[PDB]
Each structure stands twice: as C-alpha cells, then as structure tokens.
Amino acid sequence: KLKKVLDKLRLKRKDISEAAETVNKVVERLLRRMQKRESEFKGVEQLNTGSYYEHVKISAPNEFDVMFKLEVPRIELQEYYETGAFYLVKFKRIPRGNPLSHFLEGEVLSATKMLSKFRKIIKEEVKEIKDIDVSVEKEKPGSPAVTLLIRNPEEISVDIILALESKGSWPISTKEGLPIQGWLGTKVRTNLRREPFYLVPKNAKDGNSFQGETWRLSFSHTEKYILNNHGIEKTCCESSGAKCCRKECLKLMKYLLEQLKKEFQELDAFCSYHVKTAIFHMWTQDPQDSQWDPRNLSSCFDKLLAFFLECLRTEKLDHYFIPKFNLFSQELIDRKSKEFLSKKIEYERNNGFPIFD
DNA sequence: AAATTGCCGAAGACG
C-alpha cells in the first residue's frame, strides 16, 4: 500500500535526463560568469545540495539546490543574541585591499549588500541566456537564495545559494549537535566536524523587520553526507549490503506534508526541513539498520508520524546541529498552526492516508 | 591551470 505510493513518487529516468541537462547547462554558465576577473565572488566553487542530490526528491525532478560557496579566510563570528544559528561577520584584520570591502558596513560584512550584488550579477547573466527559457523569481526576505525559474517546458526551479566557507572550528552552539555517536559513530562525527562550516545570507527576523547583516549557519554538506552514508553498517544500501527503508520514510513524510501544504495555506510556515530534521532524530533514536528493514516500512513510517506529532504537540523540534535552536518555537511557528497540522496528520493517519490520492 | 578524463556508487528500468 505504501509501496504503491512510493512507486508513484519515484522519479522517472527520462524526466531526470531532460531536467539535469538543462539545469546543469545553466548553472555552469552562472558559475563561469561568477568567476572571470572583476567580480567579488571569484573563487566560488559549486556544491550541489538538496533533496535531489540526496536522492530524496519526490514526484518530479523540478527543484534543484546549488550552493556557490566562497572561501573567506580570517573571519570572526558574533552570535546574534542567543539564536545559535544567526551571526554577524567581521574580519580578523584590515583587507589591505581585497574583494569584499564593498559589502562592509564598518567592520561587519553585511549579508544584504553581498547578496544583492550576487543577485544583480546572476540577473544580468540570465538576461543573456537565449537558448533556454529561464527567469529570476522576485526577491524574498527570509530567503538566502537567488531562485531561477526554468520552463523546460516543465517548470523547474534552481535555488542558487551564496555561501561563505570557513575552515575553522564550528561555532560552539553546535558543540552538542550532530549526536550520531551510537549510530554513525565517533570517528565519522569527528571527521564531519573537521570539514568547513558555511554561512548563508538568510537574515534573522528580529520582529517583523529583518536584521539585514546577519548570516545563518548551513550544514547542507554534512546533511548530504549523512543521507549517502546513513547506516550503522557500512554496507547499508550497497551492492553487497542490505537495503533499508530510511529514505523511503523520508519521502513518505515529505509527500504527506507537501500534499497538506497544497490545499491548506494554514501551513505555509512548515516545510521539508522540518520533516528532514525530524527524521534525523528518528535515525538517532533508532540507529540499528535492522529497525529500518523494508519489511517494516509501515511501522517505521508510523513511528516517524508519532514522533512528529509529539514534536508538534510539545512545540519542540531541536535543530539537529544546533540544539538551542527550536524550529517549532512559538516565535517561528505560531501555536495555532502546529495544532492545525496535528489534526490533519492525525486525520490522515487514522483514515489510511486518503490524501495520498 | 581551467577543462577533460576515468572510475564507480546510487538507483531507475526491465524482465
């Protein structure tokens, strides 16, 4: 029954080839444009992130996430209040004379001027794309992405996300995050945390304004690794290993949410990352590969559902990397919303998920 | 050195 639904969600290869071909051609053009003398954003390198590159994209290959990461040495972080996720950026010492001073505001490296330039360049370059139908969607407070809209003729969107790369140790609000010791283990956790961390120009919302110079932590790269390396056994989902249902559960919970979001705008606050964050916790709670045996798909999905209902009910979903940061705090998602989603989920759960049709 | 090449895992397609 859930097998059937998964069959429908599964991406068709033909559809992937036509989408990738177009998406890739456009990104390499923008990446290439981004280099090339002049621009502040030279040494940017590409990192593909997102449901698609984690292989958990459903229904259609019509959403692509791309990080344009920039290595910036000698930066100091100041925690924006006690958010844990948001920061101000300064430099160790004076530039002499170097690219990113035209994004400063005194000593602070403002996310907003840096993003506005980045968007301006992307816009001038999309202007010149003649063989493909692509446009830049209008700006949005609360998003760090310059979003492309591609009609292939199918509608495809590409979020191009500027990122600052920092090679130093992770900020201490992450010190007790990534709790994978009993699952992926201590050597993996330590190795993961020796990788760089990234900041993206999503501004912290103070009230109903946005604090324009703040940046947000991003662990898209880390999350991408974990999806490709998700078992306690090294052979999970390999040719000489056992298939598990972890990813299948993530897709099912994704589908469920996205359907409810379609016909209910009481849910615009919710999103996929909530479901992703939740399943990460499930994977920590149930680290054994044997617990996610495909035979057990139904009970694994329902356990995920029960856990997600419990997060809603108790108004608490800890960020997986930054345990201070409550994604289900009253300030980000109002109580009323959380109860509405709870009743809809509970409804589908007890009625054999009619919305799956 | 910016662009090509080689290698192979993840997973779709098909019987």
Added chain:
DNA sequence: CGTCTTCGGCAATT
C-alpha cells in the same frame, strides 16, 4: 530479485 544503464562526484591529469 539480476543486470544494465545514466547521473553525480571526485580528483588526477594535460
């Protein structure tokens, strides 16, 4: 299920 395929990712090579 096995096998064959395309795509993504990576870094050695020119």
